[PDB]
């Protein structure tokens, strides 16, 4: 069953005038006139090409004359790719073992009560109430309006602790920074083209989390392979690509080392947003991508097991559900299914409030409900990492 009916297809030209069949004679057409005439023959025009070049009427060459048409298909992962099997597929493409819960090295930063902004419930209540209610002139702010403002204001609350820690004066957050990283995985080449908001750069790299006992203990782990799903579903099969490793930056850049990828889901529609398992998969591929490009910038394109492993953490959100991720990239020999594996610590479904009421009901007042500040304790644990 073919798609597209004949009435919507390009209508075939009527068959040629029978004069074009007689071999001896030149037809007499309306091409001597400069207009259609129905009692002369329809001429056959040579395929015209505009000699000069104009940009608004450019017609690019077909997909062989492009100077990088590699026949071996690269599967690309851009920020819009909504994966199918959720986290398992990114764990396969990443060659990593998952560990539920953040490590004690990160959560112990907020173990003492000294690492606290004063009245953190009042401040985070004001960030939630500001962005989700008090923000704009509209009566309720839409998600595209408030979600970067929730993330941005929480980063300003954690940025207000330069008074307690001077080291946070060595980190910036850049935006519209696009990294890229290609790696081989069993049979076919993969690329992540990373274009997400708020890569928080530092001067200093993050100190590693997993010891060599745990990295070595990843060898007996096996990746849970899956089926019928070939594990490249919903990536973008591109033939016209370029293998390239980009940290997003020119060389010689202060604040060069990625710290946290603050990637968010600010689409107003439920179908237009990433489902939260796919959100977590997008975080694993972006932190893997930027950490991997950091490894290619520090160590060449050498498939090896890294001695100074790179650790890049990321926070992804829908606006009220937070998903935390610490990624520990310790091998670049991705193509085998054995050896040491990367390892990642996740926090799933860490909502910082159940719901927000932007109008009073008649009973329940204006404001959030279900607020739980342990999630901001996790957020602020991730901001204080390496300080």
């Amino acid at each position: 069953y073919e798609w597209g009916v004949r009435s919507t297809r390009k209508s075939e030209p009527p068959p040629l005038d029978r004069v074009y069949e007689i071999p001896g004679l030149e037809p007499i057409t309306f091409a001597g006139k400069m207009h259609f005439v129905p009692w002369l023959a329809r001429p056959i025009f040579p395929p015209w090409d505009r000699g000069y070049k104009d940009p608004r009427f450019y017609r690019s060459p077909p997909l062989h004359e492009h100077p990088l048409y590699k026949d071996q298909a690269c599967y690309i992962f851009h920020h819009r790719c909504r994966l199918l099997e959720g986290v398992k597929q990114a764990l396969w493409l990443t060659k990593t073992k998952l560990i539920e819960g953040l490590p004690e090295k990160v959560l112990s930063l907020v173990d003492d009560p000294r690492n606290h902004i004063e009245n953190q419930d009042e401040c985070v209540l004001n960030v939630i109430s500001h962005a989700r209610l008090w923000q704009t002139t509209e009566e309720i702010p839409k998600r595209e309006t408030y979600c970067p403002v929730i993330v941005d204001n929480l980063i300003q609350l954690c940025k207000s602790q330069i008074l307690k820690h001077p080291s946070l004066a060595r980190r910036i957050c850049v935006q519209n920074s696009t990294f890229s990283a290609t790696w081989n995985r069993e049979s076919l080449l993969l690329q992540v083209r990373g274009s997400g908001g708020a890569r928080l750069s530092t001067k200093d790299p993050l100190p590693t989390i997993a010891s060599r006992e745990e990295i070595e203990a990843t060898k007996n782990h096996v990746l849970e392979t899956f089926y019928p799903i070939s594990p490249i579903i919903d990536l973008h099969e591109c033939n016209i690509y370029d293998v390239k490793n980009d940290t997003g930056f020119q060389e010689g850049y202060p604040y060069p080392y990625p710290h946290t990828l603050y990637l968010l889901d600010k689409a107003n529609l439920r179908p237009h947003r990433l489902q939260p398992d796919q959100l977590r998969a997008k975080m694993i591929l972006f932190a893997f991508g930027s950490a991997l490009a950091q490894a290619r910038l520090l160590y060449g394109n050498d498939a090896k097991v890294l001695e100074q492993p790179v650790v890049v953490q990321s926070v992804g959100t829908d606006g009220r559900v937070f998903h935390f991720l610490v990624f520990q990239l310790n091998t670049t020999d991705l193509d085998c299914n054995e050896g040491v594996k990367n390892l990642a610590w996740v926090d799933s479904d860490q909502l910082l409030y159940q719901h927000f009421w932007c109008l009073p009901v008649i009973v329940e007042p204006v404001g959030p409900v279900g607020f739980k500040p342990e999630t901001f304790r996790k957020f602020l644990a991730l901001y204080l990492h390496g300080a």
């Binding site: 500001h130 330069i162 008074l163 004066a169 519209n176 930056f249």
Partner: protein, 322 residues
């Protein structure tokens, strides 16, 4: 329906007109590692960040200069939080609307079924600063309330529609950047950047090279009156209950490369003809000329990096409520 005062305005000599609409005296003047972080932001946006899509010239100040100014404010509010703890608890709104609606004057309707009737001429400013800093407490005033100053406000000789100023009817908004339930109603500082139309390259190409600095000055008066005035409305004051204390805010506005600095001291919400009879009091806008932050940027670093411009940014960010 009301006049629609645009702060970042193409109109010639719109500064003198806005001092009429606003009842302001424009007084010229004012009442280390920061250089490293500033040059890090400059070189970050011009040089170090790799662009996927090619930055054309029209696309520039949307792509290039806007996150430059965002990064400057977020890093200076970062680093200057120990020197000024009021910025540690101060809200930082990025591209957030400020509206103010006031009534200034009277007009008898010249044509129509309403002819010969007093219709007071309303105005609204809708503005988006690039980013503003709002404190829960209020900066102390620069000059005393009801400070006399001998220079006189302009008086236009014609209808404000003879400046290209146009009328619409839409929702009258008085808005500081957030609704009135927010605890941070008062305002510290406000950072603007002039749009692609108001480049000084065009203003030199067109023969209005005089009005270049006027553009800065107009964005001074319309924005800050719409901000301080809106702050005065959130504290309950209005045109008949005039402000009992002066409301003060502050603005560095720029072209991306040239910076100018402004202070604004709202003393009167009494702008109507009913309320400008026993009203000697007036609003005062302090201002500087424009000075370039850097001079050029080549391949690797900046050249001709001025330092007093960073010191006036910092001295704006460093004052405090009491």
């Amino acid at each position: 329906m009301k006049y629609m005062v645009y702060p970042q305005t193409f109109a010639l000599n719109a500064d003198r007109w806005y001092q009429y609409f606003t009842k302001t005296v424009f007084l010229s003047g004012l009442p280390a590692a920061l250089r490293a972080v500033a040059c890090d932001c400059l070189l970050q946006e011009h040089f170090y960040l790799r662009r996927r899509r090619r930055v054309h010239r029209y696309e520039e100040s949307e792509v290039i200069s806007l996150p430059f100014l965002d990064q400057l404010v977020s890093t200076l509010v970062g680093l200057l939080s120990p020197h000024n703890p009021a910025l540690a608890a101060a809200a930082l709104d990025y591209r957030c609307p400020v509206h103010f609606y006031w009534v200034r004057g009277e007009e008898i309707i010249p044509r129509g079924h309403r002819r010969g009737r007093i219709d007071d001429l309303r105005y609204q400013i809708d503005d988006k600063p690039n980013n503003q800093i709002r404190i829960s407490k209020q900066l102390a005033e620069f000059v005393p309330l009801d400070y006399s100053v001998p220079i006189e406000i302009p008086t236009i000789k014609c209808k404000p529609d003879k400046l290209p100023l146009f009328k619409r009817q839409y929702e009258n908004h008085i808005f500081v950047g957030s609704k009135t339930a927010d605890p941070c109603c008062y305002g510290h500082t406000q950072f603007h950047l002039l749009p692609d139309k108001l480049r000084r390259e065009r203003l030199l190409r067109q023969n209005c090279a005089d009005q270049i600095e006027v553009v800065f000055r107009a964005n001074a008066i319309a924005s800050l009156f719409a901000w301080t005035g809106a702050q005065a409305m959130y504290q309950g004051f209005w045109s008949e209950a005039d402000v009992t204390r002066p409301f003060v805010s502050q603005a560095v506005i720029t072209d991306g490369k040239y910076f100018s600095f402004f202070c604004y001291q709202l003393n009167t919400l009494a702008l109507t003809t009913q309320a400008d009879q026993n009203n000697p009091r007036k609003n005062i806008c302090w201002g500087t000329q424009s000075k370039p932050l850097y001079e050029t940027i080549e391949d690797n670093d900046v050249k001709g990096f001025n330092d007093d411009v960073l010191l006036q940014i910092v001295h704006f960010l460093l004052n405090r409520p009491k």
